[PDB]
Amino acid sequence: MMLYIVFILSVIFVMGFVGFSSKPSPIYGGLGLIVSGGVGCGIVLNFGGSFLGLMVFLIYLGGMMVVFGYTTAMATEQYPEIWLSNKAVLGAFVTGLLMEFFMVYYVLKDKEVEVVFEFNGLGDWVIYDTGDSGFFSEEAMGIAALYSYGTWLVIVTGWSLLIGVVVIMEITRGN
């Protein structure tokens, strides 16, 4: 069963997406995005992306989603709603989970489903690589190449972040 941990993790990924996509109060909305973000990091970890997965926790969850919850607490109702207590929120949740469960059924039963693309359900491990014994992490070498190879990426990315600060101070000044 652990042989399909990446598929099991990706099923919870979708359920968490159905969570905040059905759009309960923006406070359970942010809780579903946190669970999916953490589950989403788990998938990246199992593919060899240790640094990319940890960048999700450090930046996405501990940075972006913190500011979302912070902003949500300052300007949004303050009182949540019992999850699924609203008809539309509950109707979309069941609809999503039904399609999530039906896709899971036909792919595992038939080891294949066809929705826009062709999907094969033999497992995710079957495409893994069978050759590496280098004494370094390839992820780390690729990311570390940013400062040598990606001079142009750094410049535009740096400028955008500086301009983000300038832009956000203008937007909120009010005169």
Binding site: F7, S10, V11, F13, V14, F17, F20, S21, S22, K23, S25, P26, G29, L33, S36, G37, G40, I43, V44, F47, G49, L52, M55, I59, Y60, M64, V67, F68, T71, M74, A75, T76, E77, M103, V113, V115, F117, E118, F119, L122, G123, D124, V126, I127, D129, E138, E139, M141, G142, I143, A145, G150, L153, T157, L161, G164, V167, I168, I171, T172
Partner: protein
């Protein structure tokens, strides 16, 4: 394609529909805009990591920085909308119908 792609593509679609089907809180839609980015981060990282395309390893990081920079701008607009009306309801943004 592999099986995990089925669900990462399912999650992008779910958050796309969630984004285009509004309710009332403008905050609830910005989270759908960030669920879309999260799915695209995971989809890209799996492709790049599995294919061993080393220099592309920094693409997910750049995509994460820019999208978060976007969300910072989106939250700022939400806060300015909240000032004018006391709530982030999207039905209060209908002045420009005429």
């Amino acid at each position: 394609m592999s099986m995990v792609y089925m669900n990462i593509m399912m999650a992008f679609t779910v958050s796309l529909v969630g984004l285009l089907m509004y309710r009332s809180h403008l905050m609830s839609s910005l989270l759908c805009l960030e669920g879309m980015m999260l799915s695209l981060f995971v989809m890209a990282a799996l492709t790049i990591l599995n294919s061993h395309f080393t220099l592309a390893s920094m693409m997910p990081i750049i995509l994460l920085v820019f999208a978060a920079c976007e969300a910072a701008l989106g939250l700022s607009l939400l806060v300015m909308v909240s000032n004018t009306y006391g709530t982030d309801y999207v039905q209060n943004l209908n002045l420009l119908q005429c």
